[PDB]
Structure formats: C-alpha cells, structure tokens
Amino acid sequence: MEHTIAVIPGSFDPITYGHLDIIERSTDRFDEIHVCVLKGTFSLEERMDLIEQSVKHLPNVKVHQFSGLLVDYCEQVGAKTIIRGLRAVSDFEYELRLTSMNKKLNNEIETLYMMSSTNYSFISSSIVKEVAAYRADISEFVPPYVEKALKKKFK
Amino acid sequence: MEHTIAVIPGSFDPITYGHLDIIERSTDRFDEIHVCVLKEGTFSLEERMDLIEQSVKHLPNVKVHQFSGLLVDYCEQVGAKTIIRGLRAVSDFEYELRLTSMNKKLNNEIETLYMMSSTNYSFISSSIVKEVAAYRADISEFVPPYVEKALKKKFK
Amino acid sequence: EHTIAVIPGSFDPITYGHLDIIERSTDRFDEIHVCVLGTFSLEERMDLIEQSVKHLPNVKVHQFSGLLVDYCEQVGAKTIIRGLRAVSDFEYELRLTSMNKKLNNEIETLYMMSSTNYSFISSSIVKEVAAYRADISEFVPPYVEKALKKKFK
Amino acid sequence: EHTIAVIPGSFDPITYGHLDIIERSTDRFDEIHVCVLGTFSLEERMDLIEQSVKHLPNVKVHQFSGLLVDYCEQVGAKTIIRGLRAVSDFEYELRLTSMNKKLNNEIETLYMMSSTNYSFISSSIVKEVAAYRADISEFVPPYVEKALKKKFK
Amino acid sequence: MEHTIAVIPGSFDPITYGHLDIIERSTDRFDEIHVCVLKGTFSLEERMDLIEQSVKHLPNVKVHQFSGLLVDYCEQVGAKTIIRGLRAVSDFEYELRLTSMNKKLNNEIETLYMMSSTNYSFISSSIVKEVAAYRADISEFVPPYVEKALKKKFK
Amino acid sequence: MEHTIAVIPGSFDPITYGHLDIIERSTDRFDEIHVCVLKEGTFSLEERMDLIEQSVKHLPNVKVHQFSGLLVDYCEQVGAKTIIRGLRAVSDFEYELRLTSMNKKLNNEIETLYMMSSTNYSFISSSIVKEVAAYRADISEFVPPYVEKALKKKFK
Numbered sequence: 001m002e003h004t005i006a007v008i009p010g011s012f013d014p015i016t017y018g019h020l021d022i023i024e025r026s027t028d029r030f031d032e033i034h035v036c037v038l039k040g041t042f043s044l045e046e047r048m049d050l051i052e053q054s055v056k057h058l059p060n061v062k063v064h065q066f067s068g069l070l071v072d073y074c075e076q077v078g079a080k081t082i083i084r085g086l087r088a089v090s091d092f093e094y095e096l097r098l099t100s101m102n103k104k105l106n107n108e109i110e111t112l113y114m115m116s117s118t119n120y121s122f123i124s125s126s127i128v129k130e131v132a133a134y135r136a137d138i139s140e141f142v143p144p145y146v147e148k149a150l151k152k153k154f155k
Numbered sequence: 156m157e158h159t160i161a162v163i164p165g166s167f168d169p170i171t172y173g174h175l176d177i178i179e180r181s182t183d184r185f186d187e188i189h190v191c192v193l194k195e196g197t198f199s200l201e202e203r204m205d206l207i208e209q210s211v212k213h214l215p216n217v218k219v220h221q222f223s224g225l226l227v228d229y230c231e232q233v234g235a236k237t238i239i240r241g242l243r244a245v246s247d248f249e250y251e252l253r254l255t256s257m258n259k260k261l262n263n264e265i266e267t268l269y270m271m272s273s274t275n276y277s278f279i280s281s282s283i284v285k286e287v288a289a290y291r292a293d294i295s296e297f298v299p300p301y302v303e304k305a306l307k308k309k310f311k
Numbered sequence: 312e313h314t315i316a317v318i319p320g321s322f323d324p325i326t327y328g329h330l331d332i333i334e335r336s337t338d339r340f341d342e343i344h345v346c347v348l349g350t351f352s353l354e355e356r357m358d359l360i361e362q363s364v365k366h367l368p369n370v371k372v373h374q375f376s377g378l379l380v381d382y383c384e385q386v387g388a389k390t391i392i393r394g395l396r397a398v399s400d401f402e403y404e405l406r407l408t409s410m411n412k413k414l415n416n417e418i419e420t421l422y423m424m425s426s427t428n429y430s431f432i433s434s435s436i437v438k439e440v441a442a443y444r445a446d447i448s449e450f451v452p453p454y455v456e457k458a459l460k461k462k463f464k
Numbered sequence: 465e466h467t468i469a470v471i472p473g474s475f476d477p478i479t480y481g482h483l484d485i486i487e488r489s490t491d492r493f494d495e496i497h498v499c500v501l502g503t504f505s506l507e508e509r510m511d512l513i514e515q516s517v518k519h520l521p522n523v524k525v526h527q528f529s530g531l532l533v534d535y536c537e538q539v540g541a542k543t544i545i546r547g548l549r550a551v552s553d554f555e556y557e558l559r560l561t562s563m564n565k566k567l568n569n570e571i572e573t574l575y576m577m578s579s580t581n582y583s584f585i586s587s588s589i590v591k592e593v594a595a596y597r598a599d600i601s602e603f604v605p606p607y608v609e610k611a612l613k614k615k616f617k
Numbered sequence: 618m619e620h621t622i623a624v625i626p627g628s629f630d631p632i633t634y635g636h637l638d639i640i641e642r643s644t645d646r647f648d649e650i651h652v653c654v655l656k657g658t659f660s661l662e663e664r665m666d667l668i669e670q671s672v673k674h675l676p677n678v679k680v681h682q683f684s685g686l687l688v689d690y691c692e693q694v695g696a697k698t699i700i701r702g703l704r705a706v707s708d709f710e711y712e713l714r715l716t717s718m719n720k721k722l723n724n725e726i727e728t729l730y731m732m733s734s735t736n737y738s739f740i741s742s743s744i745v746k747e748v749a750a751y752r753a754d755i756s757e758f759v760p761p762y763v764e765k766a767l768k769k770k771f772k
Numbered sequence: 773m774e775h776t777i778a779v780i781p782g783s784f785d786p787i788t789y790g791h792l793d794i795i796e797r798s799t800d801r802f803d804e805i806h807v808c809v810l811k812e813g814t815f816s817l818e819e820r821m822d823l824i825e826q827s828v829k830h831l832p833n834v835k836v837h838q839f840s841g842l843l844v845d846y847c848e849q850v851g852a853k854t855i856i857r858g859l860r861a862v863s864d865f866e867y868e869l870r871l872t873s874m875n876k877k878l879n880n881e882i883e884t885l886y887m888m889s890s891t892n893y894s895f896i897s898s899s900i901v902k903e904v905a906a907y908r909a910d911i912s913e914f915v916p917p918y919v920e921k922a923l924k925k926k927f928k
C-alpha cells in the first residue's frame with residue numbers, strides 16, 4: 001500500500017531506553033518514523049541532539065521539532081499515525097484522554113499504542129534523572145551518549 | 156513497505172459495533188486484515204464466522220478465519236507480523252498487558268498494537284448486547300442489521 | 312412520593328455493605344425500592360431484606376421480571392442508587408450506566424461511596440467466612456446472621 | 465427548596481463536562497448551588513458560570529470562604545454532587561469524601577458518571593487546545609468560547 | 618527477637634517461578650516459611666508434591682495443607698505473618714479485601730506483600746497452563762519437575 | 773534470626789496517624805525500626821524530626837534519622853535489609869511498583885515489604901490534614917496531640 005509515516009511524540013527529557021524500545025519496535029512497520037518534540041532539565045537543542053545520536057543506527061528515523069498541535073504536524077508531514085507507549089494504568093487513562101481529544105482535533109489521524117517491554121516498564125526520564133542526581137549507575141537505562149550527558153549535568 | 160497482514164483475534168459471540176470500530180479503523184493501515192476466531196457460548200463457530208463475514212463484506216481486504224493453535228502460530232503461518240486489539244478500560248488494559256508479555260516470549264517477531272475504542276462504543280461487549288437482546292430492547296445502535304436479525308431470533 | 316430511588320441487587324444475602332447504602336438513601340427521597348432478581352432462593356432473599364429494613368418506614372422490597380430501567384418507569388422512579396467500593400466496582404458500573412442511559416435517557420444512576428468500615432464486605436466473602444464458622448455479627452444484620460448459621464452451621 | 469444539592473469546583477473555566485453534571489442534576493433537587501473557590505479570576509469564573517447556566521432557573525452560583533461542608537450546613541444542603549470520568553477521579557473523590565464524612569456526617573456526596581461524549585473534557589485540556597487556536601465550540605458554551613478566544617486569541 | 622514463622626498461602630495449581638520468587642525472597646527474613654495449601658487441574662496430593670520438589674533446596678521451607686481459615690492455621694502453628702505477592706492492580710484490590718477481612722477474623726496476624734520481580738509480573742498458574750495446553754515451551758516459567766508434570770498433563 | 777533493622781522512609785510533613793499505623797504495626801516484627809526522613813514544604817526538617825520523635829517515643833525500638841543520598845545506601849550503611857511502605861490505593865500501588873523496580877536494580881539485597889493501611893486511616897495524608905487544619909476543623913482524629921498542637925499554631 002501507499003507510503004506510510006508514523007510520528008512518535010515526546011518531550012524526551014532525556015530520551016531513555018524506554019523511548020528507544022518503542023522507536024525501534026516501530027521502524028519495521030512504517031516507511032518512515034518521525035521523532036517529534038514540541039517547540040525541563042535539558043534544553044530543546046540538547047534534547048534534539050540526544051535523540052539524533054541515540055537513533056543514528058535506524059536509518060528510517062528522522063528527528064524534528066514543531067510548535068503547534070501534534071495532529072497539525074502530522075497533517076503537514078502526511079503522517080496518518082501517532083505511536084505512543086503504555087507502561088501502566090496511569091499512562092493508560094492519560095493516553096485515553098489525549099486520544100479522545102486528538103480524534104476531535106483531526107479524525108484522520110489514528111493513535112496506535114504498544115506496551116513497553118518487561119524490562120523497561122519502570123523507566124521514565126524522571127526516575128533516570130533522579131538516579132543520576134545521586135550518581136548511581138544508569139548504563140542499563142539510557143544509551144551511552146545520553147549516559148555521558150546526564151553525568152555531566154548532575155556532576 | 157512490503158505486503159502487511161494484521162490479525163484481529165476474538166471470540167465474536169457475536170460481533171458488535173465495538174469490534175467493527177476496530178476493524179474499520181485498521182483496514183486502511185495494512186494490505187490485509189484477518190479476523191481470527193478461536194477453535195460453547197451462545198452462537199456456534201460457523202454462525203460466528205457467518206456473522207462476521209456479513210458484517211465486514213463492505214470492506215475491501217478483510218478475511219475471516221478460524222484456528223486451533225496459538226494465535227502467534229497463526230500469525231507465523233499466514234505471514235502476519237501484527238496483532239491488533241482494542242482497549243476500552245483499565246481492566247482490558249491489565250489483561251492485555253499480561254497476554255502481550257507472554258506472546259512476546261512465544262514469538263518476539265510479532266507485535267501487538269492497540270487502539271482506544273471510540274467513546275461511543277467503549278461500553279459495548281458481546282455480553283451486554285445479549286443481555287439487552289434477551290429483554291428485547293432495541294439493539295440497532297449496538298450491532299449491524301445482519302447480527303441484529305440473528306440476536307432477535309435467538310431471543311424470540 | 313414526589314421522588315422514588317431504586318436500589319437494585321442480587322442480595323444473596325443482604326449485608327451491612329448493602330444496608331449502609333440503603334440507610335444513607337432513606338432521608339434523600341420520599342421512597343426507596345430495593346429491587347431484586349445463588350445460595351438463597353428469591354423468596355428467601357426478599358424475606359431477609361424485608362426483615363433487615365423494617366426499621367426504615369419508607370423502604371419497600373420488590374422483584375421484577377424485565378429491565379431495571381422499565382421498573383423505574385413503571386413506578387415513577389427517576390433515580391437508581393448504586394454503592395461503589397473499589398476501582399473494579401467503578402469500571403463495571405460505568406459500563407452498566409452507559410447502557411442504561413441508552414435504554415432510558417430519563418433515568419439517572421447516582422453512586423455513593425461505601426463507608427470505610429464496610430468497603431471490603433460482599434455477599435460472597437460473608438458466605439465464605441460463614442462456611443468456616445467465623446463470627447459474622449459485624450458483617451450482617453441479626454436475621455441474616457441466623458440464616459447464614461442455619462445454612463452453613 | 466425542601467432539597468438543595470451543591471456542585472463544587474474551580475470552574476477555570478466551566479466546560480460542557482461541568483454543564484453535563486449540572487443539567488442532569490436540576491430536575492432532581494429543588495435548587496442547585498454551583499459553588500466556587502488559575503487562568504481566570506474568581507470574578508471572571510463566576511460570571512462565566514452565571515452566563516452558562518442562565519437557562520436553568522433553579523441553579524444559583526456562589527462563592528465561599530470556608531469548608532464545603534460548612535457551606536452546605538449554612539444553606540441547608542444535605543447533598544454534594546460530583547462527576548466521575550475515570551479511575552483517577554474515582555480514587556481522588558474517595559479520599560475527599562472519606563474526609564468530608566468525618567467533618568460532617570450528615571452531608572452525603574453523590575456521584576454521576578460523566579456522559580460518554582464529555583468524559584475526556586477538563587478545563588486544562590480545553591485551555592491547552594484553545595492556546596493553539598483549535599475549534600472549541602464542542603467543548604465549552606458560547607460565552608466561555610468567547611472568553612477563551614479573547615484570552616489566547 | 619523471638620522465633621518467627623511466615624505463611625505463604627496459595628492453591629499452587631501448579632506452582633510457578635512467580636510463586637517461587639516470593640518464597641525464595643522470604644526465606645532469609647523469617648526463621649521458618651510454611652507454604653500452605655487449602656484442604657483445579659492438579660489434585661491436592663499432586664500440588665503438594667510439585668511444591669516440595671520445587672522448594673527442596675530451601676531448607677527452612679515446609680509444605681503443609683489445612684482445611685480451615687488461614688488465620689486459624691497461622692494461629693495453630695504460631696505464625697504472626699502472611700506473605701502474599703502483588704503483580705498488578707487487580708491483585709492489589711483483591712488482596713486489600715482479603716486482608717481487610719483477615720484483620721477482622723484475627724487482628725494479631727499481619728499480611729506483608731512483596732512486589733513480583735520484573736520478569737515474573739505476567740506469569741500465573743493459569744497462563745502457564747494455557748501455554749502448556751498448546752505445548753509451547755514453559756521452561757522459563759516453571760521449575761523442571763513442574764515442567765515435566767505439565768507436559769504429561771497436557772500430552 | 774540475626775539482628776534485623778527495617779527502614780520506614782518518608783517526608784512526614786507532618787507525621788499522621790496514617791504513618792503511625794504502619795510504624796506501630798512494624799515495631800514488633802523487627803529488632804529495630806528506623807524512620808528515615810529525606811535531606812520546602814510546611815515544616816522544616818528539624819521540626820519534622822521532632823514531631824516524629826515525640827509521636828514514636830512510646831515505642832521501644834524506633835529511631836528517627838535523616839539522609840542525604842539514596843535510601844538503599846542508607847539501608848546498606850545501617851545494616852537494614854528491609855524497607856517498609858504502606859499502601860492505601862491503586863495510585864499508591866503503581867507508584868510504589870515503579871520505585872521498588874528501580875531500588876532492586878540499585879541494590880538487590882534490600883527488599884521492600886508493604887502493608888495495607890488500616891481501613892480507618894486509608895484516606896489520611898499529610899496534605900489533607902494540613903488542608904483541614906488551615907480551616908481549623910477538629911484534627912484530633914488524624915494526628916497525635918504533639919502534632920495537633922504544632923498544626924494549630926502553624927494555622928493560627
């Protein structure tokens with residue numbers, strides 16, 4: 001069928017392996033994946049840098065930013081699909097409310113969810129930044145370039 | 156992108172507009188959709204398959220099949236790399252998480268993708284439709300006409 | 312009876328969890344109809360309720376063959392009252408009320424939170440503990456207590 | 465006013481999610497008091513409600529400095545009405561009602577399930593989408609729609 | 618302080634690694650652990666056999682059965698503690714109702730919970746028996762003796 | 773069984789009967805209990821520590837300490853092999869699961885054991901107590917007398 005683009009939105013503050021698992025699991029299912037960030041501990045430029053480094057190895061992944069509604073981004077770019085991860089019930093209820101709205105905003109865009117893998121269900125940007133603030137080891141939670149940037153941040 | 160098949164599993168006893176919401180939202184996003192039914196409840200397998208075929212024959216690319224073994228083995232046999240499931244509620248969510256955790260052990264090449272039921276159809280289930288049909292309430296908002304006819308005849 | 316609230320259930324048997332909700336409702340409506348459909352027969356269940364609510368003069372006990380929302384219409388009740396104990400109650404009641412609103416848009420379902428002492432009580436766990444001869448006086452009214460002890464010794 | 469129900473909130477601003485609950489309550493009590501405490505000032509919030517409920521003759525809008533349960537006492541309301549949308553609403557309301565019952569055992573809180581069309585609407589998401597110039601006519605009444613467009617253009 | 622016994626109740630139909638993770642995590646925290654079963658696919662005698670084999674290696678673990686209330690078992694035996702696992706929200710609400718009752722039945726017995734490890738959050742006796750019915754591999758979910766018994770059962 | 777220490781962490785701003793429910797249920801089950809407080813909210817650290825000490829001085833074996841680093845490192849420094857936490861609600865549960873998953877990565881020798889709050893104290897939190905105290909409702913059911921006195925003086 002036709003050319004397909006999916007958009008994976010987030011603040012990526014910073015990007016983690018929780019985020020990359022979803023991105024990686026999505027690259028074989030769409031022609032292109034756009035990782036999209038709006039417009040926190042890392043600046044926009046820094047967050048964009050961390051993502052690009054962390055998805056270097058996935059040639060069908062682009063990193064962009066946008067100031068506007070997500071569904072309007074999808075519409076400019078010709079994406080029909082938003083991809084979101086779910087780890088837990090609090091994610092689930094929140095994501096339900098977002099999609100209910102997005103469907104009002106633009107009914108041609110669908111949101112598809114995938115369940116986080118077993119090992120990553122507990123990771124978020126927040127808790128990684130908490131562990132990094134106490135300088136504990138974060139190598140299992142984030143890629144090597146992001147590991148370096150967190151350690152320099154919480155020096 | 157090469158040829159994609161997605162699989163929509165269920166018991167469909169009977170198919171409702173809650174199930175069709177998901178099926179019509181998936182038909183444009185893959186080359187083919189297989190609706191896959193397992194192997195009593197109130198309609199036989201052959202009846203459930205007939206109801207589905209009549210309820211989806213307006214779509215271009217939806218096939219209705221039975222199985223037998225594991226869902227993930229059905230997906231491998233047919234070349235589907237995706238399972239599609241609807242989420243309505245928190246309790247759906249927790250159950251689906253347990254199933255996908257297991258299916259990833261069984262075959263980590265198959266992804267399960269979820270979509271949220273539309274707000275109008277969240278509350279519908281085969282079970283509650285049969286309840287209401289048994290009391291002979293008007294069920295035309297809940298199921299397609301061919302299914303409506305079959306329920307009415309089941310329940311008098 | 313300008314206003315009637317209906318309190319449905321299986322009541323197999325009625326417990327102080329059910330009575331909590333019933334007693335809290337009495338002052339808010341001219342009449343309350345406890346409406347019924349296991350371990351106890353229908354006739355038995357109805358008698359256990361009748362005896363348990365006889366101290367509440369605006370509460371009446373009935374049975375119905377048909378949809379709840381058609382009962383409400385028939386008696387002129389515009390309100391169904393349901394108790395909530397837990398997240399699982401909440402989701403289940405959300406589905407039932409979504410459908411009831413489709414069946415009859417003019418009846419509302421109102422919920423009350425179970426009181427904290429009675430949040431863990433169901434007919435099922437009372438019966439289970441009764442089968443083991445536990446002391447059940449804190450969970451059910453005296454007439455139900457007797458019926459449970461008779462059933463299970 | 466044999467019976468008064470109180471509907472509390474921040475209403476910052478009132479949306480059709482709030483109005484859903486208010487409109488569904490009007491027929492069930494002699495009076496409804498919408499009771500108030502952000503993006504809009506108190507005075508602004510009160511005006512937006514007043515204009516949004518002027519078609520409902522038994523609804524009045526008030527503010528209070530003090531505990532909700534003391535307001536209810538003061539006006540003679542024995543019922544607080546709250547809407548439930550989701551599991552997270554449910555848990556939060558359970559804690560508030562547990563405490564309100566301790567503060568005044570004679571006031572009951574009754575819940576209604578938000579209607580399915582309006583389940584996802586909050587003041588917060590309406591404001592967010594308004595900040596982006598989205599069409600908001602399906603989420604808020606016309607007088608609130610104007611106030612949001614004025615605020616955000 | 619004094620001698621301590623904890624009781625880990627269940628139907629163990631059959632025992633899984635989800636169950637054994639909790640048992641194992643509990644053995645260093647009490648002087649004795651009693652695995653207790655009341656009085657399904659495996660008979661009582663079979664279930665007791667599967668447990669004893671699976672906890673052979675934990676010398677402070679006993680396996681018993683009882684027909685009576687759990688808190689009365691704890692009381693006969695001098696246990697002050699029931700240990701239960703939690704995997705998910707549905708577990709949580711159910712376990713809350715059980716403990717609320719058990720506290721009425723006997724207030725001297727406390728129930729302590731531990732969270733299932735990441736890898737075992739999805740396993741139950743039920744789902745293992747479903748996988749075993751389709752003869753898929755269950756070696757990651759159950760110990761070797763139980764693996765053998767399931768395969769012979771779903772031959 | 774050798775000497776056991778269990779640690780009860782929190783902010784305790786201020787300690788309430790909800791926190792004490794857990795602390796009194798744990799004092800008989802370990803040799804020692806450390807109540808461990810982190811490192812504004814409405815009471816300073818030194819005040820929060822004072823309130824706890826006065827609220828627990830009737831128990832035999834409860835010490836009140838501050839830290840600084842990671843909880844799990846506090847446990848290692850002190851020889852505690854157990855963290856005790858109360859659960860009131862589903863939302864407590866999900867949050868605690870995320871924390872214990874992480875703490876097991878940080879130190880897999882420390883176990884987190886949970887107990888359900890008693891039904892009478894489930895709804896209490898430091899937050900709601902301060903709310904009610906600010907309106908000068910009677911708070912004697914919610915906090916011990918020494919804490920009751922301190923809240924009253926905070927809020928007039």
Ligand SMILES: COc1cc(OC)nc([C@@H]2CCCC[C@H]2C(=O)NCc2ccc(Cl)c(Cl)c2)n1
Nearest residue numbers: 009010036037038066068069070073098101102
């Ligand atoms: C479905 O996934 C998300 C994620 C999300 O925030 C991460 N917000 C939204 C919003 C849902 C309804 C209200 C406006 C929606 C929005 O579009 N806010 C701007 C926004 C945010 C994030 C990005 Cl990456 C962009 Cl381009 C643009 N839906």
Ligand SMILES: COc1cc(OC)nc([C@@H]2CCCC[C@H]2C(=O)NCc2ccc(Cl)c(Cl)c2)n1
Nearest residue numbers: 164165191192193222224225226227254257258
């Ligand atoms: C994600 O969707 C579903 C749905 C579901 O319903 C029972 N079960 C499964 C199962 C999950 C792991 C254990 C066995 C798994 C299985 O395969 N169970 C039977 C099953 C077989 C074959 C078919 Cl064709 C169906 Cl439709 C259904 N995953």
Ligand SMILES: COc1cc(OC)nc([C@@H]2CCCC[C@H]2C(=O)NCc2ccc(Cl)c(Cl)c2)n1
Nearest residue numbers: 626627653654655683685686687690715718719
């Ligand atoms: C807390 O852990 C459990 C687990 C559980 O079932 C696995 N039931 C109970 C029950 C809770 C209240 C009602 C009676 C309680 C019971 O005691 N039922 C008999 C019973 C069951 C299991 C066993 Cl192993 C025994 Cl010895 C004896 N609490």
Ligand SMILES: COc1cc(OC)nc([C@@H]2CCCC[C@H]2C(=O)NCc2ccc(Cl)c(Cl)c2)n1
Nearest residue numbers: 781782808809810839841842843844871874875
């Ligand atoms: C199980 O109990 C708690 C409670 C809690 O509250 C913040 N956080 C933690 C944290 C969980 C993993 C990431 C860092 C972990 C930590 O250690 N965070 C700071 C923290 C430090 C030191 C102390 Cl002494 C306390 Cl009380 C609290 N686990």
Ligand SMILES: COc1cc(OC)nc([C@H]2CCCCC2C(=O)NCc2ccc(Cl)c(Cl)c2)n1
Nearest residue numbers: 319320346347348375377378379380407410411
């Ligand atoms: C709000 O409370 C209940 C409770 C409940 O029990 C199961 N079912 C219902 C119904 C759910 C919508 C589908 C039909 C429903 C019904 O009306 N079933 C007949 C019914 C049941 C209970 C009673 Cl007491 C009566 Cl008179 C008549 N709504």
Ligand SMILES: COc1cc(OC)nc([C@H]2CCCCC2C(=O)NCc2ccc(Cl)c(Cl)c2)n1
Nearest residue numbers: 472473499500501528530531532533560563564
């Ligand atoms: C049931 O609905 C609400 C809503 C709510 O808003 C936050 N708070 C409350 C309270 C929760 C118990 C502790 C005191 C509580 C209170 O009474 N706070 C003053 C208060 C708040 C809202 C209003 Cl509208 C008023 Cl008049 C006065 N119960």
Ligand SMILES: Nc1ncnc2c1ncn2[C@@H]1O[C@H](COP(=O)(O)OP(=O)(O)O)[C@@H](O)[C@H]1O
Nearest residue numbers: 009010011012013014015019090091094124125
């Ligand atoms: N109110 C809320 N309830 C539940 N989760 C929330 C809430 N607000 C933010 N989040 C979560 O915080 C994270 C940050 O936001 P988001 O822009 O989606 O992605 P990211 O984590 O990539 O920066 C998300 O994983 C989101 O699910």
Ligand SMILES: Nc1ncnc2c1ncn2[C@@H]1O[C@H](COP(=O)(O)OP(=O)(O)O)[C@@H](O)[C@H]1O
Nearest residue numbers: 164165166167168169170174246247250280281
């Ligand atoms: N906690 C739960 N445990 C078991 N099943 C659940 C739970 N929550 C939702 N469900 C499932 O929803 C099912 C109906 O869906 P399914 O059998 O997959 O077919 P269909 O999609 O045709 O309705 C019920 O059999 C029920 O098992």
Ligand SMILES: Nc1ncnc2c1ncn2[C@@H]1O[C@H](COP(=O)(O)OP(=O)(O)O)[C@@H](O)[C@H]1O
Nearest residue numbers: 319320321322323324329399400403433434435
């Ligand atoms: N999926 C479900 N979740 C929660 N409760 C359920 C479910 N299915 C049936 N029930 C019944 O709803 C009950 C509340 O019962 P109701 O219909 O009012 O009769 P009663 O209150 O006498 O039990 C629970 O005690 C249980 O018997």
Ligand SMILES: Nc1ncnc2c1ncn2[C@@H]1O[C@H](COP(=O)(O)OP(=O)(O)O)[C@@H](O)[C@H]1O
Nearest residue numbers: 472473474475476477482552553556586587588
């Ligand atoms: N922990 C919480 N969970 C859910 N809602 C919360 C929480 N804390 C505060 N709220 C507020 O409760 C609101 C319901 O608000 P309420 O107190 O009635 O004012 P309003 O309805 O105008 O928002 C949500 O919109 C939110 O602003």
Ligand SMILES: Nc1ncnc2c1ncn2[C@@H]1O[C@H](COP(=O)(O)OP(=O)(O)O)[C@@H](O)[C@H]1O
Nearest residue numbers: 626627628629630631632636707708711741742
């Ligand atoms: N109504 C229910 N809701 C949630 N979980 C349940 C329910 N009924 C049984 N269970 C679960 O089924 C399993 C079997 O029961 P139990 O006797 O505790 O242990 P086991 O799994 O060792 O046989 C448990 O893990 C228990 O949590």
Ligand SMILES: Nc1ncnc2c1ncn2[C@@H]1O[C@H](COP(=O)(O)OP(=O)(O)O)[C@@H](O)[C@H]1O
Nearest residue numbers: 781782783784785786787791863864867897898
């Ligand atoms: N979803 C959640 N996210 C963050 N915190 C939560 C959540 N649910 C409950 N809590 C926590 O309950 C806390 C109060 O407990 P804590 O800070 O450990 O100390 P204390 O035990 O003294 O109250 C709040 O800060 C709050 O963060």
